Amino acid sequence: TLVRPKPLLLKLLKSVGAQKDTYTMKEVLFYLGQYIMTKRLYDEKQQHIVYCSNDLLGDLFGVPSFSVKEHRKIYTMIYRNLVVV
């Protein structure tokens, strides 16, 4: 499943080295994750928790925080920022 990220997500992916306009979900998650890890949006004590308030990611996802353990929720928010090819 190749997807085409909407402007805002494309901007975040490319901010961590992404170069294409089209990607597989695994590549999206990889860059999305390198973005979180690079910025250190996660909590040191509760490392599965992400704080993205006032961030590009918070804008993207529409939430102030989320847990990486909630896969369906993460998939939902990501899907809202891409069109499936």
Ligand SMILES: CN1C(=O)[C@H](Cc2ccccc2)O[C@@H](c2ccc(Cl)cc2)[C@H]1c1ccc(Cl)cc1
């Ligand atoms: C599946 N996956 C990844 O591919 C990347 C891996 C990565 C880490 C560092 C540098 C490059 C690539 O991120 C994973 C991950 C990110 C953040 C947290 Cl808090 C936990 C796992 C994890 C992940 C990516 C995105 C999201 Cl929203 C949740 C988890």
